[PDB]
Design a protein around this nucleic acid. Structure first.
Ligand SMILES: [Zn+2]
Ligand SMILES: [Zn+2]
Lengths: 279, 741, 275
RNA sequence: AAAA
């Protein structure tokens, strides 16, 4: 487990911490604008055969968070306080050092700070003759000073070097989702390496939205849809991140949607090894 | 029938205890004279056979197996069709039921304090724990009248016995905190579970039902309620939310009643149904586990098909034996068999819809859409136009709840019927519900009362309680957020209080029998179901007394209870009558408990026309904020810091800082009028403290501004706790919001 | 298609106090630090409103350059409450009336919605500028760390016309003289439209020099002032290879009136040689 | 999610 880590140093507020389903859609729309139609299909074939990306997770100044495995909920008592056991079950994102602890079913600590805030700003709509207003509210993810968001990449390097690294320079100047004409999804991209110490077992947590091909072990269900060139995507049951499959490669699904081209929904897994309890 | 004679015999065998404390007539023969005397007049010989269960329990007369025989020949088993085998078996079964269910009413919270005797009507005399042989005589007289009048059907006696025997202790001993109602309720529950398991008197005498996995705990729990009831956009009235909180209650009671009516059980088996989380006791036969699995697989599919992965019911069961209802050694066996089921609940909540098996497939129908009130997914139509604004399409089960929110005050109950009938408003997973206006079905749920009036003697009575105080509008219905925000002191806002009992699972994991758990769960239930509306009526001021109040408490306050349940509530209303109500409910929960349990409250003051998902996620976040700090707190108002308060801390502040600046009913003191700017600019001097707590400039500026709080103390700087200028935001800011802003 | 992205950078100078508000009236501020900022929507919609009024004046004189302004009469649709009956401000969002075109192929020829974006039904022409959010220049964070006041508190009053009774309120205004740092990213989607789009965007900016930006503007709370640093073209090949191919025009000391005529024949001669 |  040596992964490339893409860091998205934010220039403004995001609309949401991007799922893998809206990272892959953004990459496909970048590739279709800087390369062409016939190079999105080679991207899709590279992700079918090889590579996988994960969801975006928050970072805050050289500490990188990863989602909590669901493998710790059924045997959180055997790890061990009732206040600690409850706060240790509520929490969503573990630190990289703790996350590698909890993959082996060891006692771990939750971070005492979230790297962003869901704030809703009031906006207004004024008619041009009478300046007569109308409020609506708008939610967004407002980050701290050194904090931001990142995701991980496995697979070969010519796919990263020909597809994902140009896609990230394109999407820095047209954002990842949301009101990107208000300067919302925009960022500066920079790449590092991350290494993850992971136990080699039969079970794997998925760091991206799964959409499985068989029933997993422990899961946390997540309906979402999308919007593809104006057309509404039907709601799909992804598995949320941090969920335990065994040997389940996931699967992308092609949609119809009445367009000039097929629309793939990225339903692949991102496996890290995990140690389970007896169930 | 033996299967109802057993439950009635286990329900009327310790009825000889109030007639013996009264001193009318050996504790059992002097309790069987009651049933024997009642059997002749106003009734039949039905009551005559039920004196066997009082003569022959507690090891007083069931010796040698012959004194039963002359008396049971002296009565007629053939007139009721019972066998000499059957009723002689039912005596032993009721005896072991009482055995392995058992082991002034002292309070379950502080066992050092007792209860005065009362009836249970939620309209007078809040049973605060405190510190006569004729009051029992009046109890027995008024019980004799009711036991004369009522039907002998066991859904007709369980409303009677908890009117009267709730605050009566079962065994008169020191520190006994088990009600007599609940002792007899659980004795009957275990008796019918032994009979439906099929065990008999030779297994009773030979010591076989104990130490054999023969009982079955069923426990079920709703997951995802906060995204079911409060994920609602700006379309959707208050009456719509107040119909969401009574549609989830109807789903829950529907599932419980099919488990009872399909497993052949009575309502004595339900240990509790508080909070969307029920627990019942059942038999362990292999032709019952199959029925439970059918109930689970049908309820879960109706939940998936109706509310797509939004609400979920996690039903599990666990085989126990009779020896695990009590205490063996210093090892708690009921609280270990209950942690073996909580793990199955927890690991079943992580397989969130595994019963469906078509859940992860993609084969979608064409041309979906989305309701604007709740975000659903309805294909190419089936959206029905609303009757509020007929231009906007909504899903049909939002129309079914707008039309139910219209019929909230007019409602005496519900009738639970087969799903495709007339009058059916809303559907449960197994039944349709038709409201019971100003008498249809086989099962009539009747709210907030214990007396069946218009109900057929062929229908099942199920009494349920719901805290449903509301300010009524100029019409006869429910107020909206607009009428609530208008009628408040100060400016126009809306005060939305959540807030629940802290660390209660540790409290319920300490009970070492079901008879004790049933009492503790019923009292914690009845505080929020019943004794929270009696507060908002304006009672119990002898116990409540001094509270932070902006105005004299009105005759008819404007507060709408959205939910009030097992430990929590969610209450809206006039945003500066909600403020007095939070501290008033705290001061009454301190008194209802012995002081042993606490509650947190997150508060929010919203503009009246605000979406309800955000209006709920502000208060639900401020409850976690006021809860992870100290678990005895109150989030009084939003505040800035470098956030909540303790209760007694605020009520010690408000004795001091408030009565020197605030006169009453939204008016400041004399000569501090025309000095309103003195109250805001002090919050400027309060805000040089959050900018730097280390700079000491805020002392002489207060001394200057009061010359035109003032001094520091190392009592704060002994451990770096914040200064007294920091504990004045939530005391000045209320008085500013409720005087002319 | 796509041919590159023109990035316009510079500074805003709040010459008079700047007030936006956050629902005794606060100004909007970053929830973590606490400094103010100018939103991207509050800047973009003010630019769009100014250019809407300018276009509504010129629905007779631009019908040959821009078609589909022939489908509109100058006015508004508030009295006759049918949307897109034929007046210019044709769409009603909630209670107010905006000109937003109803289709793609009618908004490709309307100069407002070609640049600022339309919504329609089944169609949705997205925008073509990104008005990036504007934060204080690091000089004005250093002045914020010197303890200096970055906002003020201005007390105003209303006065009875006969008896001269004071009725005061307070507004929280940004200190006059402040500096924010803006960015506007235009997306070159069609190589014909680029000259007219950047000329219309600079026209919309120059109406904002003589108008205001949020808050009580006619009581003296606007007077924004654009101080450009540089433009960049960022071509299609730049996002492919990541070298330095982007033309950097330099206009470090130029105003938006000195930029529309002085540089448009001259500082864009290099960009028209690459299209 | 501290039995909503
Ligand atoms: Zn709906
Ligand atoms: Zn247009």
């Amino acid at each position: 487990p040596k992964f490339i880590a893409v860091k998205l140093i934010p220039k403004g507020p995001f609309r949401d911490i991007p799922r893998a389903d809206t990272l892959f859609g953004a990459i496909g729309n970048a590739i279709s604008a800087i390369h062409g139609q016939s190079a999105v299909e080679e991207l899709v074939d590279a992700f079918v055969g090889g590579a996988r990306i994960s969801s975006a997770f928050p970072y805050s100044g050289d500490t990188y968070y990863l989602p909590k495995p669901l493998s710790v909920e059924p045997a959180l008592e055997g790890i061990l306080r009732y206040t600690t056991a409850k706060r240790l079950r509520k929490a969503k994102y573990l630190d990289l050092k703790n996350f590698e602890l909890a993959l082996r079913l060891r006692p771990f600590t939750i971070p005492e700070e979230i790297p962003y805030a869901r704030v809703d700003v009031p906006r207004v709509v004024l008619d041009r003759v009478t300046q007569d207003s109308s409020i609506y509210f708008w939610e967004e993810i407002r980050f701290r000073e050194k904090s931001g968001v990142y995701f991980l990449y496995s697979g070969p390097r010519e796919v990263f070097d020909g597809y994902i690294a140009p896609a990230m320079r394109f999407l820095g100047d047209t954002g990842i989702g949301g009101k990107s004409t208000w300067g919302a999804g925009l960022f500066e991209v920079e790449f590092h390496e991350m290494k993850i110490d992971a136990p080699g077992s039969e079970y794997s947590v998925t760091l991206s939205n799964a959409l499985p091909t068989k029933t997993p072990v422990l899961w946390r269900l997540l309906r979402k849809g999308g919007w593809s060139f104006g057309r509404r995507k039907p709601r799909m049951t992804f598995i949320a991140e941090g969920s335990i499959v065994k040997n389940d490669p996931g699967g992308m699904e092609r949609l119809e949607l009445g367009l000039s081209h097929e629309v793939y929904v990225y339903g692949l897994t991102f496996p890290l090894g995990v140690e389970l309890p007896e169930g | 029938e033996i299967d109802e004679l057993t439950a009635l015999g286990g329900l009327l065998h310790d009825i000889g205890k109030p007639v013996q404390r009264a001193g009318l007539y050996d504790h059992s023969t002097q309790g069987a004279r009651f049933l024997r005397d009642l059997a002749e007049n106003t009734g039949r010989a039905e009551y005559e056979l039920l004196s066997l269960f009082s003569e022959f329990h507690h090891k007083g007369h069931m010796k040698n197996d012959e004194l039963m025989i002359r008396r049971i020949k002296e009565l007629s088993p053939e007139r009721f069709g019972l066998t000499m085998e059957d009723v002689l078996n039912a005596l032993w079964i009721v005896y072991e039921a009482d055995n392995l269910a058992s082991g002034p009413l002292y309070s379950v919270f502080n066992p050092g304090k007792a209860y005065p005797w009362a009836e249970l009507d939620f309209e007078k005399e809040l049973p605060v724990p405190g510190d006569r042989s004729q009051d029992y005589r009046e109890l027995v007289k008024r019980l004799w009248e009711e036991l004369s009048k009522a039907k002998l059907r066991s859904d007709r006696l369980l409303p009677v016995l908890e009117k009267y025997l709730t605050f009566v202790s079962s065994v008169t001993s020191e520190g006994n905190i088990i009600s007599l109602y609940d002792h007899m309720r659980m004795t009957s529950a275990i008796a019918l579970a032994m009979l439906r398991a099929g065990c008999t008197a030779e297994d009773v005498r030979s010591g076989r039902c104990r130490k054999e996995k023969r009982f079955l705990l069923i426990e079920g729990d709703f997951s995802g309620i906060q995204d079911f009831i409060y994920r609602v956009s700006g379309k959707g009235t208050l009456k719509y939310l107040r119909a969401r909180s009574a549609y989830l209650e109807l789903i829950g009671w529907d599932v419980v009643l099919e488990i009872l009516s399909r497993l052949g059980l009575t309502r004595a088996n339900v240990v509790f149904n508080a909070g969307g989380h029920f627990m019942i006791i059942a038999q362990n036969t292999p032709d019952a586990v199959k029925e439970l699995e059918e109930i689970r697989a049908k309820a879960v599919e109706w939940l998936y098909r109706e509310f797509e992965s939004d609400l979920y019911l996690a039903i599990e069961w666990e085989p126990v034996s009779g020896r695990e209802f009590g205490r063996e050694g210093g090892k708690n066996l009921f609280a270990e068999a209950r942690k073996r089921l909580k793990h199955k609940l927890t690991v079943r909540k992580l397989k969130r819809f595994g019963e469906i098996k078509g859940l992860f497939e993609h084969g979608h129908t064409e041309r979906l859409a989305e309701c604007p009130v709740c975000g659903r997914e309805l294909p190419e139509g089936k959206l029905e136009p609303s009757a509020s604004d007929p231009e906007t399409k909504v899903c049909p089960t939002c129309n079914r709840l707008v039309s139910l929110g219209g019929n909230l005050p007019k409602l005496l109950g519900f009738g639970r019927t087969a799903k495709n009938d007339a009058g059916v408003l809303v559907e449960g997973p197994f039944s349709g519900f038709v409201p019971y206006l100003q008498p249809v079905g086989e099962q009539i749920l009747v709210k907030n009362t214990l007396n069946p009036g218009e109900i057929p003697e062929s229908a099942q009575f199920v009494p349920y309680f719901v805290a449903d105080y509301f300010k009524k509008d100029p019409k006869g219905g429910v107020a909206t957020f607009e009428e609530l925000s208008m009628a408040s002191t100060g400016t126009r806002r809306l005060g939305v209080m959540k807030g629940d009992v802290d660390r209660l699972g540790e409290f319920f994991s300490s009970m070492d029998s079901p008879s004790k758990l049933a009492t503790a769960s019923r009292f914690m239930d009845y505080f929020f179901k019943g004794y929270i509306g009696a507060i908002i009526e304006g009672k119990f001021g002898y116990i409540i007394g001094d509270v932070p109040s902006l105005r004299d408490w009105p005759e008819e306050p404007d507060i709408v209870v959205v939910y009030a349940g097992g430990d929590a509530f969610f209450i809206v209303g006039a945003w500066d009558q909600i403020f007095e109500l939070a501290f008033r409910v705290r001061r009454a929960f301190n008194a209802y408990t012995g002081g042993k349990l606490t509650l947190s409250v997150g508060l929010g003051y919203f503009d009246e026309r605000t979406p309800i998902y955000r209006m709920a996620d502000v208060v639900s976040e401020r409850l976690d904020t006021a809860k992870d700090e100290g678990r005895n707190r109150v989030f009084v108002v939003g505040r800035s810091r470098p956030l909540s308060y303790e209760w007694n801390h605020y009520e010690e502040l408000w004795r001091t800082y408030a009565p020197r600046i605030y006169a009453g009913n939204g008016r400041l003191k004399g000569k501090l009028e025309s000095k309103k700017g003195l109250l805001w600019k002090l919050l400027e001097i309060r805000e040089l403290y959050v900018r730097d707590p280390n700079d000491v400039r805020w002392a002489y500026l207060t001394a200057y501004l009061l010359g035109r709080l003032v001094g520091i103390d190392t009592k704060a700087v002994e451990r770096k706790e914040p200064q007294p200028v920091y504990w004045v935001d939530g005391v000045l800011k209320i008085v500013l919001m409720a005087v002319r802003r | 298609r796509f041919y590159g992205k023109i990035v316009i950078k510079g500074k805003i100078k709040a010459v008079t106090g700047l007030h936006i508000g956050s629902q005794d009236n606060p100004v909007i501020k970053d929830p973590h630090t606490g400094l103010p900022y100018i939103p991207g929507s509050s800047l973009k919609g003010r630019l769009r409103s100014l250019f809407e009024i300018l276009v509504n004046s010129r629905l007779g004189e631009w019908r040959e350059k821009y078609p589909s302004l022939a489908n509109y009469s100058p006015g508004s649709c508030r009295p006759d409450n049918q949307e897109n009956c034929g007046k210019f401000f044709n769409r009603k969002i909630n209670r107010g009336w905006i000109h937003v075109c109803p289709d793609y192929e009618t908004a490709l020829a309307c100069p407002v919605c070609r640049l600022f974006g339309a919504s329609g039904k089944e169609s949705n022409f997205p925008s073509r500028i990104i008005v990036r959010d504007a934060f204080l220049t690091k000089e004005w964070e250093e002045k914020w760390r010197a303890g200096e006041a970055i906002t003020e508190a201005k007390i105003e009053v209303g006065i009875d016309r006969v008896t001269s009774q004071a009725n005061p309120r307070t507004n929280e205004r940004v200190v006059a003289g402040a500096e924010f740092e803006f960015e506007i990213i235009y997306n070159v989607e069609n190589t014909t439209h680029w000259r007219d789009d950047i000329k219309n965007l600079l026209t919309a900016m120059a109406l904002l020099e003589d108008s205001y930006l949020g808050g009580s503007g006619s009581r003296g709370y606007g007077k924004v002032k654009f101080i450009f640093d540089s433009f960049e073209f960022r071509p299609l090949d730049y996002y492919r290879t990541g070298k330095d191919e982007d033309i950097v025009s330099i206009d470090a000391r130029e105003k938006s009136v000195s930029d529309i005529l002085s540089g448009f024949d001259s500082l864009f001669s290099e960009v028209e040689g690459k299209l």
